[PDB]
């Protein structure tokens, strides 16, 4: 399988539909081909040449959120031909600047750019997503970041102005100058609550969702329950609610850190990898510290109330009222594991497929059955060096059979399943993996694309038909 290495740790990874795979390591962005061997173009954001981390970041506890220079990498306007692809590239450089660029060649010039769009702190969180809103249905960017953090020297001081000291989520107009944010286009943080660490940002049902959790960056501990904020998909901020995520199932002390986030679009179910504290070094490790939980988005929407707890509201101060409602993650769909760090979920034939990353470099795969019940995970790939997997697992937009595995300074192109390992029809269809099927003409278990199809014959036997439908069936 293909592999790409960098001199610096990878901070962000995103794959364009038609244009190459974009990867950001130190202070540079690389446009790689889908085969991960040819760098089509590069972007020296800090200084021409040297991509060495202008500074140095010490990767804390494996459960603690990491530090990075790249804060935002989002390809957009790539659905169909006629408009042209655009790319949003954000960083900690220039007070958390973000620029809009032509999706493709990095040597080209950026169209618009603005400062204070993203968190200027290397360890500060940032999660953004592009959406459509307004009369003309224009493109807007919604960004949630930890903009304010305790900083000593005023020579570097990048914290936003006093009027913007409490801003948590901000809406930007992509066509507007400096990616302008309007007066009523921001959600503010409730004071004294400490800091909020945003994990992801996604669109679902007319609203934008922001998975996060209260986090003290100084002490390195979670000061609350992991939650999700909901806002309407509009030009101005309309707070719709806040709900806590409960995934402390197999753990006696509970799990307060959300490490990875993935929305299963065809299922309307959100997948999250939760974890408890690891002592500090990696002390309190246990076969129950991390877990995978699936939440019904309709339950999140229903339980998210416009109460002021982590965010300021109109007729409520802060924490002087009702508490946020908790949401349960679908029983028996939970996967308790010792060290999970990343997740990506999709629906193949009709079954829910979940890819999991671990702290020792394993890429696991879980296929849900009847009632979204979880089976025993299959190890699809293992990293030689045992490098913990990056919290973002990116699928291949061109080939459905591939998934990009990122860890440390390496990006690999991994096949979603090992079909050829099976050498019998029954032996292969009992495995119940929607990606694999018995190809009658070649007498091998393969992907749908590896087997020749014809309308007059049934050459590729899928899982839905059953193992009993094999030619030799007892």
């Amino acid at each position: 399988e293909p592999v790409w290495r960098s001199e610096q740790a990878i901070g962000a990874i995103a794959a364009s539909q038609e244009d190459g795979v974009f990867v950001a390591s130190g202070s540079c962005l690389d446009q790689l081909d889908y085969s991960l061997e040819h760098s089509l173009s590069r972007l020296y954001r800090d200084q021409a040449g040297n991509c060495t981390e202008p500074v140095s970041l010490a990767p804390p506890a494996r459960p603690r959120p990491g530090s990075s220079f790249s804060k935002l990498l989002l390809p957009y306007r790539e659905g169909a031909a006629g408009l042209g692809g655009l790319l949003l590239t954000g960083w900690t450089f220039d007070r958390g600047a973000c620029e809009v660029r032509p999706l493709g060649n990095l040597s080209r010039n950026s169209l618009r750019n603005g400062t204070e769009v993203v968190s200027c702190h290397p360890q500060g969180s940032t999660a953004g997503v592009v959406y459509r809103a307004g009369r003309n249905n224009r493109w807007y960017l919604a960004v949630a970041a930890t903009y304010v953090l305790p900083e000593p020297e005023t020579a570097s001081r990048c914290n936003p102005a006093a009027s913007d000291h409490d801003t948590a989520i901000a809406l930007k107009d992509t066509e507007g100058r400096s990616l302008a944010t309007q007066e009523l286009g921001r959600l503010k943080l409730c004071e004294g609550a400490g800091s909020l660490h945003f994990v992801d940002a996604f669109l679902w049902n007319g609203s934008i969702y922001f998975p996060y959790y209260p986090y003290n960056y100084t002490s390195g501990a979670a000061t609350g329950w992991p939650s999700m904020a909901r806002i309407a998909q509009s030009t101005e901020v309309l707070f719709q609610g806040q709900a806590s995520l409960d995934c402390g199932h197999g753990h006696p002390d509970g799990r307060r850190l959300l490490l990875s986030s993935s929305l299963v679009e065809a299922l309307d179910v959100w997948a999250g990898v939760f974890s408890a504290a690891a002592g500090e070094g990696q002390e309190r490790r246990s076969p129950t510290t991390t877990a995978l939980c699936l939440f019904r988005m309709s339950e999140i929407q229903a339980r998210a109330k416009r109460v002021s707890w982590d965010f300021k509201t109109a007729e409520s101060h802060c924490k002087e009222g009702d508490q946020p409602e908790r949401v349960q993650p679908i029983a028996s769909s939970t996967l308790i594991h010792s060290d999970l760090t990343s997740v990506y979920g999709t629906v193949v034939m009709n079954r829910t497929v979940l890819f999991l990353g671990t702290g020792d470099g394993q890429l696991l795969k879980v296929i849900l059955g009847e009632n979204l019940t979880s089976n025993c995970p299959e190890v699809i790939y293992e990293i030689k060096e045992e490098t913990p997997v990056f919290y973002k697992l990116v699928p291949d937009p061109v080939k459905n059979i591939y998934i990009y595995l990122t860890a440390g300074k390496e990006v690999r192109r991994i096949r979603v399943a090992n079909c050829n390992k099976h050498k019998s029809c029954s032996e292969c269809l009992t495995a119940t993996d929607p990606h694999c099927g018995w190809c009658h003409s070649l007498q091998r278990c393969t992907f749908q694309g590896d087997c020749v199809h014809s309308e007059n014959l049934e050459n590729w036997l899928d899982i839905s038909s059953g193992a009993k439908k094999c030619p030799g069936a007892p």
Binding site: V117, P160, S163, G176, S178, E183, L184
Partner: protein, 383 residues
């Protein structure tokens, strides 16, 4: 002497404005117009709709509070194609300072039902939406505002009284400036805020009496410069009027240092307007918002400076018959009209059986009251 054009019944006066020499009086439910001695009335949605504003944009616009949902209408009823009202009228009956220069609207009217007082510039000919930083504008709001040139650039000047609660509750009067065509911030977050806003303390002391609460203001352009008349109130028995030279004020904003900032100021000073398209730098914007007050206090011109009585709510000026570059200052209370002669320094008073609201001078002084509008002054005696 005084010709009263009475309404059909006593009205609650909410606001009065002058545009094309036409007096626009806003009442609870309707709006009256007055010009060429004829009174015209156009009734609007009658309930608890307080008409607080009458401005001149591309057309005459009249806005009201409705039943908690601000809306604007055309002079002769109508719908208003622009569908504005949000920042054009408050949600509750209150004082308002909204002005329109050419077609650019500047207002202190709350944009939402949840307080947060700001001085804003809406999207138009002068640029897009702009608003002041947090707590810059007091809960009392802006008391007066006008547009005046400073070089080749137009600037907006506003007056307001700030309350400071450190050890004691102290009120302080200020005059602030900003560029009419100010682009805005330089970040994404501050792109819609004023980048040239500065303020200076105003002084109006007579004999130990230090006036702080601003009531009304009027700016008159002369040959040399612009003279700003400001009437102050006090929790005691007297009120007072002080005048200021706009040239002196412009000099101060232009050359005076910033209180609290001892380091060197940037090549292009903080409150200086930039050419169309140019944006104020980050280093400059960081200073201006943290140090927006000058290390100075503007002293008033020697004359005119007079006092009493407390309770004044409005005033207007009229030049004393082209033979004298002197003036007659008319100001009012609840049931009394006053006139101050700047040459003789004599003040007269006249009682009326009406609840007075304002004095707006055109060719003759108009007195807007709950009963109607009185054209011309009554026979006054030396108070």
């Amino acid at each position: 002497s005084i010709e009263w054009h009475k309404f059909e019944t006593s009205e609650e006066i909410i606001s009065t404005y002058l545009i094309d020499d036409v007096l626009y009086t806003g009442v609870n439910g309707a709006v009256y117009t007055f010009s060429n001695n004829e009174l015209n009335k156009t009734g609007l949605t009658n309930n608890n709709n307080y008409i607080t504003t009458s401005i001149k944009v591309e057309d005459t616009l009249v806005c009201g509070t409705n039943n908690g949902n601000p809306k604007c209408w055309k002079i002769d009823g109508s719908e208003d194609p622009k569908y504005r009202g949000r920042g054009y009228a408050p949600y509750q009956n209150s004082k308002v300072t909204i002005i329109s220069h050419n077609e650019c609207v500047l207002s202190d009217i709350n944009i939402s039902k949840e307080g947060i007082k700001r001085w804003r510039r809406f999207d138009g000919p002068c640029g897009y939406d702009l608003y002041t930083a947090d707590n810059v504008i007091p809960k009392d709001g802006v008391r007066g505002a006008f547009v005046d040139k400073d070089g080749t650039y137009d600037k907006v000047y506003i007056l307001f009284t700030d309350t400071i609660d450190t050890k004691r509750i102290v009120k302080i009067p200020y005059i602030a400036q900003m560029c009419l065509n100010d682009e805005g911030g330089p970040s994404s977050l501050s792109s819609h805020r004023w980048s040239t806003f500065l303020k200076v303390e105003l002084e109006c002391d007579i004999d130990g009496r230090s006036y702080r609460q601003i009531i009304h203001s009027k700016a008159i352009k002369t040959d040399n410069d612009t003279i700003l008349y400001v009437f102050f109130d006090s929790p005691y028995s007297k009120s007072a009027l002080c005048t200021y030279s706009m040239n002196a004020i412009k000099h101060s904003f232009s050359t005076s240092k910033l209180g609290g900032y001892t380091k060197q100021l940037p090549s292009p000073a903080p409150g200086i307007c930039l050419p169309a398209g140019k944006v104020v730098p980050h280093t400059t914007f960081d200073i201006i918002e943290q140090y927006n007050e000058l290390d100075d206090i503007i002293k008033p011109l020697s004359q005119p400076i007079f006092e009493g009585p407390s309770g004044v709510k409005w005033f207007d000026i009229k030049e004393k018959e082209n033979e004298h570059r002197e003036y007659r200052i008319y100001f009012i209370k609840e049931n009394t009209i006053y006139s101050f002669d700047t040459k003789s320094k004599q003040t007269r008073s006249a009682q009326v059986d009406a609840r007075l609201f304002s004095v707006m001078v055109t060719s003759k002084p108009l007195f807007i009251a709950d009963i109607g509008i009185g054209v011309g002054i009554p026979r006054m005696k030396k108070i």
